[PDB]
Amino acid sequence: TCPFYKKIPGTGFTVDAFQYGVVEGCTAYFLTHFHSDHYAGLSKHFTFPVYCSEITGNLLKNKLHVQEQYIHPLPLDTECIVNGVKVVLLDANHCPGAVMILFYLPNGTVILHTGDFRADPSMERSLLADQKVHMLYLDTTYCSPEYTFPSQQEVIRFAINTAFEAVTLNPHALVVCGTYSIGKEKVFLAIADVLGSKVGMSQEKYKTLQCLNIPEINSLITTDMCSSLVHLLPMMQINFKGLQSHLKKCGGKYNQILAFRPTGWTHSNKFTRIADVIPQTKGNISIYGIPYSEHSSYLEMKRFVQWLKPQKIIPTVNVGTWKSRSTMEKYFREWKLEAGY
Ligand code: NI
Numbered sequence: 001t002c003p004f005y006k007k008i009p010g011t012g013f014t015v016d017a018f019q020y021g022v023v024e025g026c027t028a029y030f031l032t033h034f035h036s037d038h039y040a041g042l043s044k045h046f047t048f049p050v051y052c053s054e055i056t057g058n059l060l061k062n063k064l065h066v067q068e069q070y071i072h073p074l075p076l077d078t079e080c081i082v083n084g085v086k087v088v089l090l091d092a093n094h095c096p097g098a099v100m101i102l103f104y105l106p107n108g109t110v111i112l113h114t115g116d117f118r119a120d121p122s123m124e125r126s127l128l129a130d131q132k133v134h135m136l137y138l139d140t141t142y143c144s145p146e147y148t149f150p151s152q153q154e155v156i157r158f159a160i161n162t163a164f165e166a167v168t169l170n171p172h173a174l175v176v177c178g179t180y181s182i183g184k185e186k187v188f189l190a191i192a193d194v195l196g197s198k199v200g201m202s203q204e205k206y207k208t209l210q211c212l213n214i215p216e217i218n219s220l221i222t223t224d225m226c227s228s229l230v231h232l233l234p235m236m237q238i239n240f241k242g243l244q245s246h247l248k249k250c251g252g253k254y255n256q257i258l259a260f261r262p263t264g265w266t267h268s269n270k271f272t273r274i275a276d277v278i279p280q281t282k283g284n285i286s287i288y289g290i291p292y293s294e295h296s297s298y299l300e301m302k303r304f305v306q307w308l309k310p311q312k313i314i315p316t317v318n319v320g321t322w323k324s325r326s327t328m329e330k331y332f333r334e335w336k337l338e339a340g341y
Contacts, residue, residue, distance in 0.1 A: 005137065005314050008113070012087055012107045015113050015137070018042045027083050028072075028223065032096035032115025034059040037183055051082060053089060055097030058211035059182075077127060089127055092117040093273030094294045095183030096212040102127065112308070113137040114316070117298040121305035128308065138309035141295040141317045143328050148298070149291040150274045156190050158274050158288060159260060163191045165228070166258045173256040175230045176246065177237035182208060183294050184262045189220060191260070192230040226253070227293060238281045239246050247285075256284045262292040302335055309341040 002020040007013075012027030018041035023029075032038060041253045042050070044065035049072055054062070059075035060066040074080050076089050076099070086104035094116045103111040112133045167173050175195070177188040192199045199221045201209075206223050214220070223230055233246065238261045247257055269291055279286040296304070305313070313332050318324040 005319065006315055008029075008103055008111060010107060010109065011103065012083055013085070013103070015101065016115070018046070030113075031060070032092070032101065032113070032303065033055055034063075035095065035116065035183075038060070039064070040118075042066060051087075053097045053099050055211065055213055056099075058278055059097065059208070063208060081092060084178055088127055090123070090128070093120050093123075094118060095181070096185070096214070098304040099183055110311070111135045111137070114139045116141075116294070117296060118155055121303070123304065124307055133308055134311045135310065135314065136305070136312070136317050137314045138293060138301075138305070138319055140315040140328055142265060142293075142298055143301060143315070143318065143331060145298045146270065149265055149269055149293050152186065153293060154274050155290055155292045156186055158277065159187060159288075160190050160194045163258060164194045166256075167195055169247075170256055172254050173258055174247070174250065176238070176243065176257055176259040177230065177232055178235040178259070178261045179205065180235040181300075182212070184212070184292050185209070185212070187260060187262050187290070187292055187306050188230055192220065192228075194231060197229045198222040198227065199232060200225040200229045201232040205232055214242075214302045226250075238287065240285055240287075243285050243287075257286070259285070259287045259288060261289045263289050264293050265291060272303075290327040302331075306335055306339040311337070 002017050002023045002251050006015055006017040014023050014026050015030045016032055016038040017023055021139050028049050028051055031246050034056050046066055048068055051072045057071045062072055080087050081208055088102040089099040092098040092100050092115050099227040100177055102112045110133050116139050177190055188199050203223055209221055238259055243257050279288045315328050
């Protein structure tokens, strides 16, 4: 049974609600992004209208085989009428194709559903500038002040400089980058660009990347692993055993691996600057954990909410414990008292 924080009151609409069977009263199912916790339940047998971005619709058709007649892609930044209700899709600054949804309810209430997002000051000059929001359904993944991490630009600068130094010292070093979902493509694209290489990967991952509308993608990626010195592997293989095994397969082309694990936050963020990050090393293999986040930090979330001044907040993450719910409610009241709304 579908939980309350996935229903949009006053509509026939749900958000990210495909694992509950046929939801009573639902006439249109929105999908914010192509991450498995959110699409859980969708397949080629789905026969209700799915509303989403173009990129998400490419993934639904090619990866999950949902039939074309049920996929309803909408352009971004554009007022659209769906089943008699005005909606807008906004870029969420999460993974490719990820949106926030603005719903203009028939009674005059305005609702923002962030989906998953990484708040940014640029969102203060979107279509959100123009009107008031009564209800905010908020991605609260990192809603606590201990969750700190650098900008995505600082993280990429560290990765590019680290990879370029290692391979210039040793032209026979291979770079490997872990993946388990869409998102965080800039990690491996920026490294391959500084090295003058295409990125090599499995046929299954190539297919996924081909759905993302990335400019000049055919110039950037390949399934011919032997021609490439940046390889993508499943995240589960990014350990000394999996990497050893991979280096065997390369036919003595390489004699060293430098590997990256983009994580979200880890507690080593509580002590260490990005600049001071060091790898784990065993022989000719080194592994870096890099804090590349596609979710808001505490400070970025607080800024966004203090700007938007919603009348009510409904969290969509960390909702399963009373302690998490109480913590999040305390910070919402601080923010409101401090800013005066
Ligand atoms: Ni996500």
